[PDB]
C-alpha cells in the first residue's frame, strides 16, 4: 500500500532475477570453478580463443583462423558482438589469457540470461498487459532446456545473446509502433520519437552483429507489414507510421552492420558477408515501398481507379511478387549425427512424442500452446495487429523448432510470453487478482474457492518448470579432467611450443579462399582427432587440429577426402598414412569416446550413409535366465526371457580399423605410431580400482559383466569404461581365430596421445626357412599400466624389414621397460632402439 503500488511489478522482477541468479550462477558454481574454470561444451572454447586474440590486437579482431583445420584453415562466423563484449570485459578486469580470462567469460552468458527478463517483460507488455508482462518476465527466469543450459555459468556462447536481441528487437520495434501510431503531424519525429525505431535498429543491429543469420528477423518484420496490408478488410493498424518505424529500424540496423559487412568474399548466410547488408538495406526499401502504397491508398488510388478496397491487398501481392520475383535476377541424416539438430517432437527412431517439449520447456510449452490458441481467437475477434504480429513470430519460432532441435532456445520466449497470457487470463477470471487487490487493499466480490484453483493452476505451471531447471543447472558440461590434463600436457611437451603460442595470438590476413594449404610462417604440424575436440585442442593445447567443431576437417572415405573420418575408419596402415601425410599430421589424440559411442558417427561420416556403416557392428550379449554369457549375431538367435545388454558389439571389420589399432590395442600392431601419453582411467573405473586390481583377467572381467547386467536391467547401457572391456572380451572370442594382438582384457586411460613417427627401419636376411619375423617389447605408460607391443612382418626374397615406432630413451613418459625381443623361427636377439634412429628413420642392418 506504501511500497507495493509501483514496486509490486519491480519486486517480482527482482525476485525473478534472483531465481535466475540461483539457477545460472549458484547451481553450476562447483562444476565450472573446479581444477580449472570449465567452459562448457565446444563453442565457448573458441570464443575464448577469439576474445583472447582480440584482447591481443585490440581494438580489432581476426576473421580467418589458420590455427584450426590445420592444412587449409577455417573462416570465423562467430559474431563480433560477443567477441568484443568479452574482450572489453576481459580488459577492464585485467584478464587477458589463461584461467583469468575464462573466469570473466563464465559470467557473460549467465548475466545475459538474467538480463533476458527485461526484453521478455518489454515485448509482452506492449502487445498485452503489464500483468502478463510480470508473469512472462518471471517465467523466462526459470524456463529450462536449451535456453537454460546455454545461459549457465561457464558457457560463453552466442546463443543467449541470440534470443536476447531477437526478443529485444521485436519489443523495441513494437514499442516504436506504439509511441508512433496516431502521431504523424511532424510529432512523428520531434527529435524524441526517433529514438524508438532507432533503438529498434540498434537491437536488430546488435542481433546480426552477434549471429550471422540474424537477418532472418527482417522477413519476420516484413511479414508483419505484409499481413497488416493484405488484411485491411480484417485488421486495423497505422500502416503509415508502421512503415516509417520499419524503414527507420532497418536503415539504422544496416548502418550498424555495415562496418562488419566485408569479412567474407562472396555472399554467405552465416559468415559476415555483404549479403546480410543487402537484406537489411533491402528490407528498408520494401518498408518504404509499403509506405507509398499506403500513401496512395489514402487518396483512394484503389477507388478512383475502379478497383475497390477489396482489391488493395492485390497491390501488395503484386509488389511482394515482383521484388521476390526479380531478386534472383540481379535429407542426409548421416552427416547430422550431432546432438544439437534432430527432428523435434520426434523420436531418434522416428516417432511422434512430446517428451522433447517437456524436457526443454516444462509446463510452459503446454501453457504456451493454450496461450497461443487463446491469442488466436482473441485476435480473431479483437482484430488487434500486434497480437497477430506476435502470433506470426510464434508460428515462425515453431516452424524452426519443428525441424531442428537446436532452436529450442528461440521458443522459450514464445512459451514464456504465451504461458503468461494463459496465466493472466485464469488469474483474472478466478479472482486471484481481486484477492491480491483486496487482501492488501479494499475487499471485492470474490470467491476464495476460485482463488484456490487459481493457485493450483500456477503450481502446475511453475513447479515442473522449476524442478527441471533446478536439476538441469547443476553441472557445467565441458571437458573432463582426463581431457584437460591431457591437452595441457601437449602444450608443454610437444615441439614448437613457443612458436605456436606466438602464432596463436597473431592477427591473420583474410584470404580470398581456403582451398589451398595455408602458407605457415614457421615449421607447423597437425594434430588429428574427432572434430568434437578441435576447439579444445586449439584453445588449450595450442596446437593445430585438422577436424574442428566447425563441421570441417572430417573428410570421408566414399570420396577419398583426407580427414578425421577417413583416417580413424581406415582399415590398414597404408591408407592411414595416406590421409596422414596429405594433412601433415604429427600427433593423434584418441579417447575412450571415439573408441565406443562416437565410432558410429565416424563410420557414417566416412561412408556418407547409415547402412554402409552397419557393416562395422554386429550382435549383442544376452544373458539367459540360466546365467550364461552369449553372443547372438542376429535378434532371433536370442534365447527367450534373456536380458540383453543394450550395447552394440562391433563386428570383425571394426577390430582392424585405425581407431581400434590405437586406443583398443594401446598402439600395438602399429609401425609409425607410438604412444606418448595416456590419461587416467575413466572415472567409473577409477573408483573400481580401490577393490579390484586391473592386471588379471577373469577378475576385471567378473566386475565388468556385473556392471553391464545390473545396469542392463534398466534401459541404460554400461559405462564407457565398461564398454571398452566388453569390446576387448568380444575380441578374444570373435577375433579368436586371428588374435593379431592378443590383448589383456582390461580398462585403459580415458584419453591417449600418439606420435606419427618415421620409425627405425630394421632389415636383414633370415635363415630362408621361416616366413615371418616377430618383434615384441613390454611398454609402460604414464599411469604405470603395462602392455605388450607386437608386430609381425612377412619374409620376402629371404629378407625382412620391420619399422619399430617406440624408442628406449624418449623424453615422453610412455616408453618400454624391456628391450625389443625380435624372433624369426628360433634365433632371437636383444636390441635396444634409441630416439636418434626413431625420429630420423635411420636404416639398421641385422641378420637372423
Amino acid at each position: 500500500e506504501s511500497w507495493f503500488k509501483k514496486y509490486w511489478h519491480l519486486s517480482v522482477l527482482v525476485i525473478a532475477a534472483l531465481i535466475s541468479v540461483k539457477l545460472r550462477i549458484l547451481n553450476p558454481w562447483n562444476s565450472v570453478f573446479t581444477w580449472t574454470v570449465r567452459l562448457g561444451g565446444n563453442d565457448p572454447w573458441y570464443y575464448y580463443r577469439l576474445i583472447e586474440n582480440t584482447i591481443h590486437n585490440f581494438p580489432h579482431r581476426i576473421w580467418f583462423d589458420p590455427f584450426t583445420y590445420y592444412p587449409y584453415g577455417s573462416y570465423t562466423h562467430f559474431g563480433p558482438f560477443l567477441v568484443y563484449l568479452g574482450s572489453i570485459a576481459g580488459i577492464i578486469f585485467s584478464a587477458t589469457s589463461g584461467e583469468s580470462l575464462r573466469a570473466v567469460l563464465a559470467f557473460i552468458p549467465a548475466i545475459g540470461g538474467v538480463l533476458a527478463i527485461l526484453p521478455v517483460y518489454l515485448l509482452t507488455r506492449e502487445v498485452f498487459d503489464k500483468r502478463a508482462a510480470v508473469i512472462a518476465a518471471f517465467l523466462i527466469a526459470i524456463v529450462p532446456g536449451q535456453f537454460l543450459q546455454r545461459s549457465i555459468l561457464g558457457f560463453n556462447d552466442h546463443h543467449i545473446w541470440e534470443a536476447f536481441w531477437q526478443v529485444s528487437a521485436l519489443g523495441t520495434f513494437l514499442l516504436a509502433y506504439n509511441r508512433w501510431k496516431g502521431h504523424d503531424l511532424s510529432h512523428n519525429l520531434t527529435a524524441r520519437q526517433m529514438a524508438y525505431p532507432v533503438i529498434a535498429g540498434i537491437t536488430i543491429g546488435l542481433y546480426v552483429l552477434s549471429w550471422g543469420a540474424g537477418f532472418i528477423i527482417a522477413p519476420i518484420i516484413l511479414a508483419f507489414m505484409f499481413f497488416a496490408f493484405v488484411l485491411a478488410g480484417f485488421v486495423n493498424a497505422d500502416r503509415k507510421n508502421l512503415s516509417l518505424v520499419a524503414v527507420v529500424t532497418f536503415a539504422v540496423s544496416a548502418l550498424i552492420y555495415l562496418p562488419f559487412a566485408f569479412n567474407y568474399p562472396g555472399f554467405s548466410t552465416i559468415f559476415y558477408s555483404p549479403f546480410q547488408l543487402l537484406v537489411l538495406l533491402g528490407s528498408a526499401v520494401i518498408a518504404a515501398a509499403f509506405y507509398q502504397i499506403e500513401k496512395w491508398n489514402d487518396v483512394g488510388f484503389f477507388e478512383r481507379v475502379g478497383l475497390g478496397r477489396k482489391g488493395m491487398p492485390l497491390a501488395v501481392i503484386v509488389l511482394t511478387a515482383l521484388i521476390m520475383g526479380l531478386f534472383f535476377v540481379i535429407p542426409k541424416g548421416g552427416a547430422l549425427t550431432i546432438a544439437e539438430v534432430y527432428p523435434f517432437f520426434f523420436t531418434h527412431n522416428g516417432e511422434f512424442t512430446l517428451t522433447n517439449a517437456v524436457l526443454h520447456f516444462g509446463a510452459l510449452f503446454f501453457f504456451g500452446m493454450a496461450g497461443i490458441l487463446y491469442s488466436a481467437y482473441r485476435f480473431l475477434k479483437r482484430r488487434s495487429f500486434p497480437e497477430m504480429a506476435l502470433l506470426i513470430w510464434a508460428i515462425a519460432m515453431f516452424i524452426a523448432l519443428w525441424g531442428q532441435n537446436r532452436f529450442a532456445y528461440y521458443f522459450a520466449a514464445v512459451s514464456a510470453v504465451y504461458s503468461a497470457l494463459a496465466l493472466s487470463v485464469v488469474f483474472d477470471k478466478l479472482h486471484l487478482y481481486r484477492a491480491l487487490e483486496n487482501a492488501i487493499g479494499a475487499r471485492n466480490k470474490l470467491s476464495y474457492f476460485r482463488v484456490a484453483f487459481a493457485l493450483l493452476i500456477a503450481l502446475a505451471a511453475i513447479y515442473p518448470t522449476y524442478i527441471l531447471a533446478d536439476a538441469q543447472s547443476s553441472y557445467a558440461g565441458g571437458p573432463n579432467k582426463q581431457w584437460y590434463d591431457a591437452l595441457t600436457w601437449m602444450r608443454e611437451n610437444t615441439p614448437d611450443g613457443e612458436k605456436y603460442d606466438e602464432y596463436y595470438l597473431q592477427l591473420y590476413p583474410t584470404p580470398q579462399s581456403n582451398k589451398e594449404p595455408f602458407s605457415y610462417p614457421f615449421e607447423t604440424y597437425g594434430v588429428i582427432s574427432w572434430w568434437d575436440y578441435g576447439h579444445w585442442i586449439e584453445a588449450v593445447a595450442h596446437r593445430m587440429p585438422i577436424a574442428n567443431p566447425f563441421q570441417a576437417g572430417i573428410g570421408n572415405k566414399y570420396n577419398n577426402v583426407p580427414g578425421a573420418s577417413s583416417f580413424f575408419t581406415a582399415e590398414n596402415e597404408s591408407y592411414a598414412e595416406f590421409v596422414a601425410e596429405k594433412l601433415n599430421v604429427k600427433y593423434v589424440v584418441s579417447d575412450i569416446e571415439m573408441e565406443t559411442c562416437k565410432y558410429y558417427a565416424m563410420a557414417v561420416w566416412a561412408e556418407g550413409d547409415l547402412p554402409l556403416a552397419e557393416k562395422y557392428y554386429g550382435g549383442y550379449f544376452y544373458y539367459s535366465p540360466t546365467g550364461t554369457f552369449g553372443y547372438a549375431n542376429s535378434q532371433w538367435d536370442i534365447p527367450l526371457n534373456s536380458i540383453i545388454i543394450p550395447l552394440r558389439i562391433p563386428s570383425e571389420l571394426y577390430y582392424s580399423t585405425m581407431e581400434a589399432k590405437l586406443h583398443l590395442f594401446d598402439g600395438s600392431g602399429l609401425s609409425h605410431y607410438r604412444m606418448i601419453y595416456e590419461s587416467d582411467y575413466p572415472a567409473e573405473w577409477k573408483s573400481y580400482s580401490s577393490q579390484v586390481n586391473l592386471n588379471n583377467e577373469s577378475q576385471v572381467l567378473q566386475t565388468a559383466l556385473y556392471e553391464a547386467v545390473m545396469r542392463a536391467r534398466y534401459g541404460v547401457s554400461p559405462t564407457m569404461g565398461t564398454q571398452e572391456v566388453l569390446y576387448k572380451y568380444a575380441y578374444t572370442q570373435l577375433y579368436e581365430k586371428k588374435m593379431g594382438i592378443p590383448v589383456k582384457i582390461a580398462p585403459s586411460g580415458y584419453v591417449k596421445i600418439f606420435e606419427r613417427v618415421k620409425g627405425a627401419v630394421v632389415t636383414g636376411k633370415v635363415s630362408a626357412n621361416v616366413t615371418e619375423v616377430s618383434v615384441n617389447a613390454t611398454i609402460k605408460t604414464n599411469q604405470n599400466r603395462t602392455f605388450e607391443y607386437w608386430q609381425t612382418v612377412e619374409v620376402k626374397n629371404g629378407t625382412y624389414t620391420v619399422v619399430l615406432p617406440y624408442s628406449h630413451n624418449s623424453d615422453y613418459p610412455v616408453k618400454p621397460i624391456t628391450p625389443y625381443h625380435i624372433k624369426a623361427g628360433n634365433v632371437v636377439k636383444e636390441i635396444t632402439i634409441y630416439e636418434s634412429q626413431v625420429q630420423n628413420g635411420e636404416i639398421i642392418q641385422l641378420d637372423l
Binding site: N42, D43, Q146, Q149, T337, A339, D532, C597, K598, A601
Partner: peptide, 7 residues
C-alpha cells in the same frame, strides 16, 4: 546437447 556428436 552441445555440438558434441551423439554420446
Amino acid at each position: 546437447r552441445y555440438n558434441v556428436t551423439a554420446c
